[PDB]
């Protein structure tokens, strides 16, 4: 019913832009952002880049909208957008998420 949507962005500016858009459209309730260094295989070689990770807290049924909304404004042709399941959580906190996205 609840999940953490993990996404990476090229800069703090784009990360915050994506976060504010999801919140304004009520597709998520909270977003945590932090800098990371990435290494990935692309076109026959390992590439490294500084990026920003995002942890999007929302309802699982909102995954499709968050996914498509992010993809539409993201700099990457194929951005990382993965949903991680929440097994349990403080009721008060989870209820806040629901009232926010609903």
From Swiss-Prot:
Disulfide bond positions: none
GO MF annotation list: copper ion binding
SUPFAM superfamilies listed in its UniProt record: GlnB-like
TM regions (residue ranges): none
One Pfam family of this chain: CutA1
GO biological process assignments: response to metal ion
Entry function: Involved in resistance toward heavy metals.
The family this protein is said to belong to: Belongs to the CutA family.
NCBIfam families: dival_cat_tol_CutA
Protein name according to UniProt: Divalent-cation tolerance protein CutA
Organism: Archaeoglobus fulgidus (strain ATCC 49558 / DSM 4304 / JCM 9628 / NBRC 100126 / VC-16)
Lineage of source species: Archaea, Methanobacteriati, Methanobacteriota, Archaeoglobi, Archaeoglobales
């Amino acid at each position: 019913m609840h999940n953490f949507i993990y996404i990476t962005a090229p800069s703090l500016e784009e990360a915050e832009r994506i976060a504010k858009r999801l919140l304004e459209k009520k597709l998520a309730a909270c977003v945590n952002i932090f800098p990371i260094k990435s290494f990935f295989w692309w076109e026959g070689k390992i590439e490294a880049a500084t990026e920003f990770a995002m942890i999007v807290k929302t309802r699982s049924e909102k995954f499709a909208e968050v996914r498509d909304e992010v993809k539409a404004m993201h700099s990457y042709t194929t951005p990382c957008i993965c949903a991680i399941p929440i097994e349990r959580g403080l009721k008060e906190f989870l209820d806040w998420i629901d009232e926010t996205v609903e």
